[PDB]
C-alpha cells in the first residue's frame, strides 16, 4: 500500500506469492477481511491498477518487431 520504490513492491509481491501457495483458504480469508475496511483499499487497488496501465502502454511503443523476410 505504501510501496515507495519498485524493489520493495517486487519483494513484497514475491513474499505474498510464497505465502499463499495455492490452497490456503485460511489466509485468503485474512486478505479478504483486511481489505473490507474503511477507505484503505483505494490505494492498494490503484497501485495494482497503474502497474497494469504503465506496462500495457510500454509494449505498444517499444516491442514493435516485424520479421517480414525469411
Amino acid at each position: 500500500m505504501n510501496a515507495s520504490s519498485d524493489r520493495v513492491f517486487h519483494e513484497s509481491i514475491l513474499l505474498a506469492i510464497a505465502l499463499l501457495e495455492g490452497g490456503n483458504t485460511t489466509i485468503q480469508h485474512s486478505f479478504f477481511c483486511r481489505l473490507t475496511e474503511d477507505k484503505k483499499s483505494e490505494k492498494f487497488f490503484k497501485v495494482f491498477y497503474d502497474r497494469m496501465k504503465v506496462a500495457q502502454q510500454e509494449i505498444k511503443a517499444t516491442v514493435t518487431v516485424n520479421t517480414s523476410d525469411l
Binding site: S4, L15, L19, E21
Partner: peptide, 25 residues
C-alpha cells in the same frame, strides 16, 4: 525512514524461509 535495504533483506529472509526443497533433514 530511509535505507529500505534492511526491509528488502528481511523480506528476502522470510521468503527464503518459506521455500521448500532446501534445508530439510
Amino acid at each position: 525512514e530511509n535505507e529500505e535495504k534492511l526491509c528488502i533483506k528481511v523480506l528476502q529472509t522470510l521468503r527464503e524461509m518459506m521455500t521448500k526443497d532446501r534445508g530439510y533433514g
